[PDB]
Write a protein that holds these residues in place. Sequence first.
Motif, PDB file in Angstrom:
ATOM      1  N   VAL A 139       2.451  -3.609   1.612  1.00 61.37           N
ATOM      2  CA  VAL A 139       2.377  -3.046   0.270  1.00 61.37           C
ATOM      3  C   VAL A 139       2.003  -1.568   0.314  1.00 61.37           C
ATOM      4  O   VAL A 139       1.690  -1.027   1.375  1.00 61.37           O
ATOM      5  CB  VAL A 139       1.350  -3.798  -0.597  1.00 61.37           C
ATOM      6  N   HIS A 140       2.037  -0.919  -0.846  1.00 61.51           N
ATOM      7  CA  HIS A 140       1.702   0.496  -0.940  1.00 61.51           C
ATOM      8  C   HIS A 140       0.734   0.749  -2.093  1.00 61.51           C
ATOM      9  O   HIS A 140       0.886   0.188  -3.179  1.00 61.51           O
ATOM     10  CB  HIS A 140       2.968   1.332  -1.130  1.00 61.51           C
ATOM     11  N   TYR A 141      -0.260   1.596  -1.849  1.00 57.13           N
ATOM     12  CA  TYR A 141      -1.254   1.921  -2.865  1.00 57.13           C
ATOM     13  C   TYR A 141      -1.945   3.243  -2.548  1.00 57.13           C
ATOM     14  O   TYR A 141      -2.001   3.667  -1.393  1.00 57.13           O
ATOM     15  CB  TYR A 141      -2.292   0.802  -2.968  1.00 57.13           C
ATOM     16  N   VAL A 142      -2.473   3.890  -3.582  1.00 58.29           N
ATOM     17  CA  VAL A 142      -3.163   5.164  -3.416  1.00 58.29           C
ATOM     18  C   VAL A 142      -4.463   5.192  -4.211  1.00 58.29           C
ATOM     19  O   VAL A 142      -4.545   4.637  -5.307  1.00 58.29           O
ATOM     20  CB  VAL A 142      -2.278   6.343  -3.858  1.00 58.29           C
ATOM     21  N   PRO A 153       3.556   3.015   5.027  1.00 52.26           N
ATOM     22  CA  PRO A 153       3.197   1.757   4.364  1.00 52.26           C
ATOM     23  C   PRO A 153       2.073   1.023   5.086  1.00 52.26           C
ATOM     24  O   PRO A 153       1.990   1.049   6.315  1.00 52.26           O
ATOM     25  CB  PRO A 153       4.492   0.944   4.423  1.00 52.26           C
ATOM     26  N   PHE A 154       1.210   0.367   4.317  1.00 54.61           N
ATOM     27  CA  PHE A 154       0.090  -0.374   4.884  1.00 54.61           C
ATOM     28  C   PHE A 154       0.353  -1.877   4.834  1.00 54.61           C
ATOM     29  O   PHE A 154       0.757  -2.415   3.803  1.00 54.61           O
ATOM     30  CB  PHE A 154      -1.201  -0.045   4.132  1.00 54.61           C
ATOM     31  N   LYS A 155       0.120  -2.550   5.957  1.00 50.45           N
ATOM     32  CA  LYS A 155       0.329  -3.990   6.044  1.00 50.45           C
ATOM     33  C   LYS A 155      -0.987  -4.716   6.304  1.00 50.45           C
ATOM     34  O   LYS A 155      -1.832  -4.240   7.062  1.00 50.45           O
ATOM     35  CB  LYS A 155       1.330  -4.315   7.154  1.00 50.45           C
ATOM     36  N   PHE A 156      -1.154  -5.872   5.670  1.00 46.09           N
ATOM     37  CA  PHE A 156      -2.368  -6.665   5.833  1.00 46.09           C
ATOM     38  C   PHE A 156      -2.111  -8.130   5.492  1.00 46.09           C
ATOM     39  O   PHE A 156      -1.076  -8.473   4.921  1.00 46.09           O
ATOM     40  CB  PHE A 156      -3.487  -6.112   4.949  1.00 46.09           C
ATOM     41  N   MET A 211      -0.743  -9.667  -8.764  1.00 48.51           N
ATOM     42  CA  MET A 211       0.414  -8.792  -8.911  1.00 48.51           C
ATOM     43  C   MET A 211       1.679  -9.472  -8.397  1.00 48.51           C
ATOM     44  O   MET A 211       1.612 -10.479  -7.691  1.00 48.51           O
ATOM     45  CB  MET A 211       0.185  -7.479  -8.159  1.00 48.51           C
ATOM     46  N   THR A 212       2.832  -8.915  -8.757  1.00 49.63           N
ATOM     47  CA  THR A 212       4.112  -9.470  -8.334  1.00 49.63           C
ATOM     48  C   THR A 212       4.907  -8.455  -7.520  1.00 49.63           C
ATOM     49  O   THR A 212       4.518  -7.294  -7.404  1.00 49.63           O
ATOM     50  CB  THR A 212       4.956  -9.918  -9.542  1.00 49.63           C
ATOM     51  N   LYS A 213       6.026  -8.901  -6.960  1.00 52.09           N
ATOM     52  CA  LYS A 213       6.880  -8.033  -6.157  1.00 52.09           C
ATOM     53  C   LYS A 213       7.455  -6.902  -7.006  1.00 52.09           C
ATOM     54  O   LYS A 213       7.846  -7.112  -8.152  1.00 52.09           O
ATOM     55  CB  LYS A 213       8.016  -8.840  -5.527  1.00 52.09           C
ATOM     56  N   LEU A 268       3.389  -3.820  -4.966  1.00 51.56           N
ATOM     57  CA  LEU A 268       3.906  -4.785  -4.002  1.00 51.56           C
ATOM     58  C   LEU A 268       5.296  -4.384  -3.519  1.00 51.56           C
ATOM     59  O   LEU A 268       6.238  -4.303  -4.307  1.00 51.56           O
ATOM     60  CB  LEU A 268       3.954  -6.182  -4.625  1.00 51.56           C
ATOM     61  N   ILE A 269       5.415  -4.133  -2.219  1.00 50.78           N
ATOM     62  CA  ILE A 269       6.691  -3.743  -1.632  1.00 50.78           C
ATOM     63  C   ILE A 269       7.443  -4.957  -1.096  1.00 50.78           C
ATOM     64  O   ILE A 269       8.567  -5.238  -1.514  1.00 50.78           O
ATOM     65  CB  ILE A 269       6.497  -2.729  -0.490  1.00 50.78           C
ATOM     66  N   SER A 270       6.816  -5.674  -0.170  1.00 47.91           N
ATOM     67  CA  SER A 270       7.427  -6.857   0.425  1.00 47.91           C
ATOM     68  C   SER A 270       6.492  -7.495   1.448  1.00 47.91           C
ATOM     69  O   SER A 270       5.722  -6.806   2.117  1.00 47.91           O
ATOM     70  CB  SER A 270       8.755  -6.491   1.090  1.00 47.91           C
TER      71      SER A 270
END
Length: 126
Positions: free
Chosen positions: A41-44, A63-66, A84-86, A121-123
């Motif tokens: 996902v991506h966030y700032v 992109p950050f993955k967790f 949240m959703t995609k 939410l990216i994927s």
Amino acid sequence: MEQETLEQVHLTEDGGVVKTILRKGEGGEENAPKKGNEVTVHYVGKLESSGKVFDSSRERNVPFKFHLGQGEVIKGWDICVASMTKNEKCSVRLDSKYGYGEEGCGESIPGNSVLIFEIELISFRE
């Protein structure tokens, strides 16, 4: 879907977490995240008192993955991500409780200070 209005959604009645509908994504369990799995996902992060941006995934273009369902992230991210959703981009406001408690991070986030963070939410995958 040509509307230009936003909506406020309180994550917790306590007022510690509040998300705002900015950019609607898919909508539905089919586009929902899955615990115990590598999710991307991506966030700032941005302050409301200073109005400055920090720790922005886009600011560095990475992109950050967790993995969800873990105790590595605060209730803010866990709840937001789990609410949240995609393709859903919204902004969640974390108070001085669910965030960093009473001891923020360095001299950039002093205790007793509201902070704003935008999550999208990216994927996700396995």
